[PDB]
């Protein structure tokens, strides 16, 4: 099964990736509602998920370049505000928001 653990500090996506990879895990990517809720259970605040549309705008992929199927976007999202929001966070209500990859948030790592 997948196990999810939340970080204590906030950091941008690249650091988030490095943290999870240090323990041979990856940034959490919910594949269904059950997993999305499991990630919610561990994230005490807005947290990064391992999904981006960095390759092609509005085409969301997990960190291994695999296009995602399940999505749980907050109403009005993804909106790619300003100079661009190509990373994704899980809001405190479980819904998703696209945000700048350079912004800092807690990170939830996934292991199995």
Residue 50 in contact with its own copies, rule: CB under 8 A: no
Asked if 40 touches Cl ion (CB under 5 A), the answer is no
| Segment 63 to 82, residues that bind Cl ion, using CB under 5 A | none
Tell me: does residue 77 bind ligand NDG (CB under 6 A).
Answer: yes
Length of the chain: 112
Stretch 47-66 residues interacting with ligand NDG (CB under 6 A): none
Residue 67 tokens, joined: 């296009």
Measured CA to CA, the distance from residue 84 to residue 54 in angstroms comes to 10
How many whole angstroms separate alpha carbon 29 and alpha carbon 12? 16
In this structure, what token pair is assigned to residue 61?
């992929």
Find the binder of its own copies among 14, 21, 32, 79 (CB under 8 A).
21
Tell me how far, at minimum, the Cβ of 111 lies from ligand NDG, in Å.
27
Residues 6+ apart with CB under 8 A from 68: 29, 31, 51, 60, 61, 62
Closest CB 34 distance from ligand NDG, rounded Å: 25
| Residues at the interface with ligand NDG (CB under 6 A) | 76-77, 79, 81, 85, 97-100, 103
């Amino acid at each position: 099964k997948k196990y999810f653990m939340s970080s204590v500090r906030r950091m941008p996506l690249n650091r988030a990736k490095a943290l999870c990879s240090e323990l041979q895990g990856t940034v959490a990517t919910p594949r269904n509602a059950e997993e999305n809720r499991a990630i919610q259970n561990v994230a005490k605040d807005v947290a990064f998920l391992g999904i981006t549309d960095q390759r092609t705008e509005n085409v969301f992929e997990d960190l291994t370049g695999n296009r995602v199927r399940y999505t749980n976007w907050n109403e009005g999202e993804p909106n790619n505000v300003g100079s661009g929001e190509n990373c994704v966070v899980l809001l405190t209500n479980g819904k998703w928001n696209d945000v700048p990859c350079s912004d800092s948030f807690l990170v939830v790592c996934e292991f199995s």
